Assembly symmetry: D2
Amino acid sequence: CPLMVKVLDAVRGSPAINVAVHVFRKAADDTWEPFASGKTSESGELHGLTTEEEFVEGIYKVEIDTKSYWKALGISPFHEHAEVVFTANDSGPRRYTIAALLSPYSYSTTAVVTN
Amino acid sequence: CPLMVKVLDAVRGSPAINVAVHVFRKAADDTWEPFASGKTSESGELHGLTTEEEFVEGIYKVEIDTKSYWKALGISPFHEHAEVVFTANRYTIAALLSPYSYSTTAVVT
Amino acid sequence: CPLMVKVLDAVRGSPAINVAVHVFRKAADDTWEPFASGKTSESGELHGLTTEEEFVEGIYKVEIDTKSYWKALGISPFHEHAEVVFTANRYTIAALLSPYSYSTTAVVT
Amino acid sequence: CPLMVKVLDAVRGSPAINVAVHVFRKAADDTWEPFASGKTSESGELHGLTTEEEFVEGIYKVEIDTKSYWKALGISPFHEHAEVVFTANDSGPRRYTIAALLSPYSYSTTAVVTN
Ligand SMILES: O=C(O)c1cc(-c2ccc(F)cc2F)ccc1O
Ligand SMILES: O=C(O)c1cc(-c2ccc(F)cc2F)ccc1O
């Protein structure tokens, strides 16, 4: 599994469950094409987005729909969403985990990149 | 000054200086229109982006060119940039930068 | 002012006001001795902890009473406090607070 | 496994491997007693610190030896270590993951607490 997303909730100390995630890939003509989407599980994880074959070199945008998450919990947050934009697989294939930690007026994002 | 940006470097424990910042406002047709831009100062701060008059309610995007910042230091970064997207309904957008990670917070006072 | 502390609230997007901060210096016998203390201001800042004269090289501990802060808001927090331990060899110790998480950074200029 | 520690490296985008972790428990007389210790694996994780039976109610300090980690990589970091101090199991037993994200002049810590 070459692209995984993990989301945690810094207010509740829990995984962030059922968070919508949209992934896009920058096309030849510089527009963002829909690549893959899904939502985080009970463990705050989203797997199965893509395959090794499909996940070619490119610039990818991972959009985490944080606003809808916080709104469902009764919190009016600051951000519309958390976007993570990165070049992937430009010196051959890697496995990426995009991790986000969410608070209503703040988020943090890191990537763990392995061979 | 209703909107300011502050950027810090988590590797060096310093302001992140001369970092390009571009701000956009969402247009009626769902396009991002150029609003304001600047480079962070010696103190890692960017002031004077806009005025209370022009900073009306709307959806805004603040894009921080983190890649160029790391590249000028000879450090390979993960992200293409750091984007902060919010509805304006004083705003300080702060970002703390590492090569493979960033945090962003809004202080609204 | 060689040492200042700044605390922000990540739930409200605001300075964290009236937060108790205690600073200690490590003694020769490996004990923590009381050095300086204060409460954060309306801007979430604590200045005037010490002087250049007294702020000599050594190991320092900055303890931020985050538990009391959340408790006064009716929010059950995870941590007892936030501790920052460093060797002093201007220092701004910043902390960004959530109920189950905090981040701390040092800006040294 | 009721107490786990996970450590990531924000400079390299990798788990933080072989990081020393010391856990203490506040004793009756207000001193910190050695509870458990170990070091993070190739995945940046430390498991097997304690058992359900031993991990009673109390105030625990988890000390992550970040300075030694950064020094081994040629970086002179700001902090001596990252300390996480918390009351555990005070409304019955829980499972705790203490997560840290490390940069030379900054760290972040969150806890994920489950039943
Ligand atoms: O599985 C993980 O890698 C994980 C990670 C975090 C976390 C903590 C701090 C941070 F800045 C980002 C994170 F994704 C919090 C909890 C967690 O379980
Ligand atoms: O001026 C400020 O508001 C400031 C802020 C930080 C900081 C710390 C942690 C974090 F997640 C984000 C930040 F921008 C670090 C240092 C700092 O001076």
